[PDB]
Nucleic acid binder design. Structure first.
Lengths: 152, 59, 82, 111, 129, 211, 102, 98
RNA sequence: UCAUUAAGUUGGGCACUCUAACGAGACUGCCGGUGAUAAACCGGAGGAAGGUGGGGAUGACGUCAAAUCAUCAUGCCCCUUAUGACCUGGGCUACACACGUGCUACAAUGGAUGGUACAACGAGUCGCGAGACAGUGAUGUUUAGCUAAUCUCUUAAAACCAUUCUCAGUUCGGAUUGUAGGCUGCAACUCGCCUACAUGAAGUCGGAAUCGCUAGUAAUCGCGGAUCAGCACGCCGCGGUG
RNA sequence: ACGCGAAGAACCUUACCAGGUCUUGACAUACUCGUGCUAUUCCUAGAGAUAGGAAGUUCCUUCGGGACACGGGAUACAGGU
């Protein structure tokens, strides 16, 4: 629409000190089940607490590096000549898309509990390989085809 | 039909199982406020005017 | 059920045909009928609205109403079903 | 015997290990869960040694599972033609609540 | 106990008759914990920005009286009831009340719904017949 | 669709024609008193209806009435609404009450202007000069925003013709509409005539606030 | 194609000229890619055909377009209105194919 | 213990000015807990906005109930001599109890 | 608050709930970059609220001859032995089949384990209807209270910890069924239920596609009306989470 | 257009049909009359209708009777949802 109509803001964590704790609640939390959502998030820094026992931001922020790409895409046409001319949006939206990525693979895995397949992707996020880095290189390799800007 | 459907339920039938009530202008079927003895549809014909403390502009 | 329910005038034909003769049909009406164990072995009609159905009774006919004595709920039936 | 000795599962309670069985369930299988004093039990891959021997005739209160088969059979197959206002609808196949069969009840109704 | 300070703030069909004790920062809601009235739900730690983290800090024993609402309703009554109640014990927290708000008790809610509409923003569905 | 001004005024934005309260039988006495109001408007059949507000009271009823003039309607000297009032006592069986009050200047009433000119439409008046005539009479007599409306139906015709001189600042969308408005159907062999009279002398009309 | 809904909504239905409907929408199935749904909805009345209303709606898989048009004869409404569907697809060539205009 | 409900479907009409004919009972009397605005009791109507077909929209009418009390412990039966007069409106849901 | 313990309920305490009956409370009001000059914009402070604070309403010249011949009626038609009726049950809801159509599932956030805390919550001492109770529940057995800012409703759910089923057509998933009972009414199949129980089918996340969703907004959970002897996932509003 | 009129027609409720089913019409305003308190309650049969009988109707003001018009002779036409 026309304007920069305002967004909303949730508060950052005092427990493990990240706003993406409660934004991780903003993607795992479905049907407004915020207490179960915090049970999964606090249970996931508990998944850090068995595996490494370190700060949440090691696995959580290396995970953020895995799931925050550089580039995203856009449809831009001449009259049908859809040059996929790209953009590189800011870390609130990039972090938001990475939250879609961790809710994606840390949701849709046929394992035992939400903290068990989210133990597969928060613990494999502690293994910091595979699906996330490919889940951004799937757009990163396209940029050479996205070399055109407004040329023809 | 206006008298087998107005006058008939005015005539004593068996019970409430038989003679279901309605307003007394036109014997219109249910959706009838028996708490105010009048039909919705026929009480709406008043609610052209309205003699009620309800707000009139369709809240 | 507690506080049972039963016919009245063709209850007086249960008591007017149980004593006299177990034979005839009736211009019946019943959504309010039953069957007693004494009632078995006779013939009664079922009011669909045109055909007072002449059915004798067997002990299988437990105490239902004449709205469900025989399936006189007319629906044809053998055309396109199941 | 065998009734309780029929087709043992592991990992379960005996109550689900008897709703598992054709019949005895949440009223009665919990009733003889307590009457044999079982109470979860198993999750074991062992039922007991002798609460079997209780639950032979303690379980054998239902008359019978094979006469649940012959109780549906002995019930309805006499109950064919009372009307047959209900038996024809039940065995032609529609759920005979007196149920609105216009569109839905699609699986038992038959597409 | 002693006489109140009239802390009259609330939100969203809740009542926060906040009993106001000049104290240490002790929080006891209806003689209980609000993690015993509505467990828990980190809104226990969104009592702090109403009261404790407000200006870092306000230290009074607020024996809070509430009912109504819920994890956002009477926690909004924590916001206006206990932020405004903190203003009632000490009126020197409007640096925070107009640094961050914590007032108006805005009562944002669902519309005066049009009859016929389900949630006033959703229909059954339509394809095109 | 068109909003009815009195249809959003006379309930609570203007106070009630049933300007009384009850506890349980509110719609009972209200609706049956509206049937009684129908009996008033049909048993003024040799008179002129203006306005009536039948009331229930502490004495379980006070009938509020209005006339279009006292000198002709109320009786030979005042005994038609009084003898017919006792006839209402032998209708519903209650203490029954007369209120002889002329609705002042009924050439500024939507009832007598539009219904009178509709009775002259029964007398087959040229309806355009009837519009200019009557709305010129009352617009001549004030009526800060004033219009009307006539439907069609001439011996097998369409729905509605036009409406000349349907004028006057009647800000019906706005929330300042103080309008004596009416409407009418004239049933004939040739058809029916809708007559809808907007009269706007007063400017303001909420009647809903009191300390 | 996929599905119809033939509906004579005042007079009974007769599948000679309804088959002619089925064949000119057969030429819709010469100009089809997925004939997702259609619906015939026609209306003829008294007084020696002072009208001839017909209708068919066209929910294709991307576009939807109905046709409630008239002639004196209902046969002529099937004629000129289904020919109007042909010329509508003739209007729908560049409106369908030429997603480039340049 | 004279206690007066002016129960009203809405108090905010002339029945708010009915508080003065009972203020005739406030005078010639003392110890007046005066006008108490009672919690309003609501009521709901939902009806077809059209007549018979095409129900896109409905209508609602929330008949609420704005009530009133005055609480005087002493009757002072010259205020029962003031009980005989009660002017406006014709009929309101008034309760004058002990 | 004198509380001073069935207890918010008291001889009482009184604005505390603010109770709703009232006024004042945000009007570019003020300021800066401004705007051709203005209307305005951008923002700032104040301001509880900031740019018509927010939400309903307010359907216009006019269109759709569509709907209202079952409120309302004229043209004519059957209007008088008939399309006007009294009764009686069976249809009206029937089902080869498409879309209208929501909930329920497929699952571990579930499903059992418990004890929460909440807005609502309107009719009513006409009726709602206790901790008096046979209970599996329908309902009795009692109806206490109940002219409602009394009372039975009104103690709603998720968040709470407790155990497991942590993996599967699954303590499943609830299609029926056969019943075995109660409620309603004169009567529960057509043409209401509800409470068991036993068997417990699909179903292992949904073509083409569609639609809705930028704030308490989707999602979500409850309450009442709603009709009414009986009978409501979607059926009105309100809010609980988010 | 389809949680649509119809936010509850168990069913005579219903629109409409079957059957019993009458024709001053069930419901009717209508001219006229031997003339009146219409009672409810019944009993008989019948599916109930609907028929028969029992007390259930033989004038409330100067008296025709208004009043219950009683039940009829009948223009009149309500009663098609």
């Amino acid at each position: 629409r026309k304007n920069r109509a305002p967004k909303r803001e949730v508060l950052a964590d005092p427990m493990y000190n990240s706003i993406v704790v409660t934004r991780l609640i903003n993607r795992v939390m479905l049907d407004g089940k915020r207490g179960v959502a915090a049970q999964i998030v606090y249970g996931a820094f508990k998944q850090i607490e068995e595996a490494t026992g370190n700060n949440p931001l090691e696995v959580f922020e290396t995970a953020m590096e895995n799931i925050m790409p550089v580039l995203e895409v856009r449809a831009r046409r001449v009259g049908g000549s859809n040059y996929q001319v790209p953009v590189e949006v800011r870390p609130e939206r990039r972090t938001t898309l990475g939250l879609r990525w961790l809710v994606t693979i840390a949701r849709n895995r046929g394992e035992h509990t939400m903290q068990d397949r989210l133990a597969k992707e928060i613990l494999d996020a502690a293994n910091n390989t595979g699906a996330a880095v490919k889940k951004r290189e799937d757009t990163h390799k396209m940029a050479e085809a996205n070399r055109a800007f407004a040329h023809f | 039909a206006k008298k087998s459907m107005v006058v008939k339920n005015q005539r004593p039938a068996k019970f409430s199982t038989q003679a279901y009530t309605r307003c007394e202008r036109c014997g219109r079927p249910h959706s009838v406020y028996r708490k105010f003895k009048l039909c919705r549809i026929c009480l709406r014909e008043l609610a052209y005017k309205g003699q009620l403390p309800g707000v009139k502009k369709a809240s | 059920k507690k506080g049972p329910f039963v016919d009245e005038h063709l209850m007086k034909k249960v008591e007017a045909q149980t004593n006299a003769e177990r034979k005839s049909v009736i211009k019946t009406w019943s959504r309010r009928s039953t069957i007693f164990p004494n009632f078995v072995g006779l013939t009664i009609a079922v009011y669909d609205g045109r055909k007072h159905v002449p059915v004798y009774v067997q002990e299988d006919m437990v105490g239902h109403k004449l709205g469900e004595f025989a399936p006189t709920r007319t629906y044809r039936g053998h055309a396109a079903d199941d | 015997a065998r009734f309780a000795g029929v087709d043992i599962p592991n990992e379960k309670r005996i109550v689900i290990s008897l709703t598992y069985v054709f019949g005895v369930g949440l009223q009665t299988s919990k009733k003889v869960l307590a009457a044999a004093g079982v109470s979860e039990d198993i999750r074991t891959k062992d039922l007991t040694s002798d609460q079997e021997d209780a639950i032979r005739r303690e379980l054998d209160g239902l008359k019978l599972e094979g006469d649940l088969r012959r109780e549906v059979s002995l019930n309805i197959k006499r109950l064919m033609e009372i009307g047959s206002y209900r038996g024809m609808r039940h065995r032609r196949g529609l759920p005979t609540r007196g149920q609105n069969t216009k569109n839905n009840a699609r699986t038992r109704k038959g597409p | 106990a002693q006489v109140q300070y009239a802390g009259t703030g609330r939100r969203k069909n809740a009542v926060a008759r906040v009993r106001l004790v000049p104290g240490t920062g002790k929080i006891t809601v209806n003689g209980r914990e609000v993690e015993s009235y509505i467990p828990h739900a980190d809104m226990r730690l969104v009592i702090n920005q109403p009261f404790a983290a407000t200006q870092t800090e306000g230290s009074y024993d607020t024996l809070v009286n509430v009912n109504g609402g819920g994890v956002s309703g009477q926690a909004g009554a924590i916001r206006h009831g206990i932020a405004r109640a903190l203003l009632q014990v000490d009126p020197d927290f409007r640096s925070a009340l107009k640094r961050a708000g914590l007032l108006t008790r805005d009562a944002r809610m669902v519309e005066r719904k049009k009859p016929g509409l389900k949630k006033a923003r959703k229909a059954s569905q339509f394809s095109k017949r | 669709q068109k909003v009815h001004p009195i249809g959003m005024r006379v309930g609570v934005i203007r106070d009630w024609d049933a300007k009384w309260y009850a506890e349980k039988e509110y719609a009972d006495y209200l609706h049956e008193d509206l049937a009684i109001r129908q009996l008033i408007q049909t048993k003024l059949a040799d008179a002129s209806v203006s306005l009536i507000e039948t009331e229930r009271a502490i004495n379980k009823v006070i009938v509020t009435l209005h006339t279009a003039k006292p000198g002709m309607v109320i009786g030979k000297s005042g005994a038609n609404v009084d003898a017919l009032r006792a006839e209402l006592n032998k209708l519903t069986g209650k203490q029954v009450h007369i209120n002889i009050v002329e609705i002042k200047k009924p050439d500024l009433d939507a009832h007598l202007v539009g219904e009178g000119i509709a009775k002259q439409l029964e007398a087959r008046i040229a309806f355009r000069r009837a519009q200019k005539q009557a709305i010129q009479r009352a617009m001549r007599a004030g009526a800060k925003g004033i219009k009307t409306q006539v439907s069609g139906r001439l011996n097998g015709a369409d729905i509605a013709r036009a409406e000349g001189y349907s004028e006057g600042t009647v800000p019906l969308h706005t929330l300042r509409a103080d309008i004596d408005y009416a409407w009418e159907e004239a049933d004939t062999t040739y058809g029916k005539l809708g007559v809808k009279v907007w009269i706007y002398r007063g400017e303001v009309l909420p009647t809903k606030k009191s300390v | 194609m996929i599905k119809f809904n033939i509906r004579g909504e005042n007079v009974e239905v007769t599948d000679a000229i309804r088959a002619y409907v089925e064949d000119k929408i057969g030429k819709l199935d010469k100009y089809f890619n997925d004939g997702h749904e259609v619906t015939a909805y026609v209306n003829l009345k008294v007084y020696t055909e002072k009208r001839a209303k017909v209708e068919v709606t066209l929910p294709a898989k991307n576009v939807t377009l109905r046709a409630e048009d008239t002639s004196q004869d209902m046969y002529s409404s099937i004629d000129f209105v289904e020919e109007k569907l042909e010329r509508q697809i003739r209007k729908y060539k560049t409106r369908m194919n030429r997603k480039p205009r340049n | 213990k004279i206690r007066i409900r002016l129960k009203a479907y809405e108090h905010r009409i002339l029945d708010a000015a009915a508080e003065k004919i009972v203020e005739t009972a406030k005078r010639t009397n003392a110890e007046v807990s005066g006008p108490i605005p009672l919690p309003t009791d609501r009521s709901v109507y939902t009806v077809i906005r059209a007549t018979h077909k095409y129900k896109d929209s409905r209508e609602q009418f929330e008949m609420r109930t704005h009530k009133r009390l005055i609480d005087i412990i002493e009757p002072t039966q010259k205020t029962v001599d003031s009980l005989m007069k009660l002017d406006l409106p014709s009929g309101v849901n008034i309760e004058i109890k002990l």
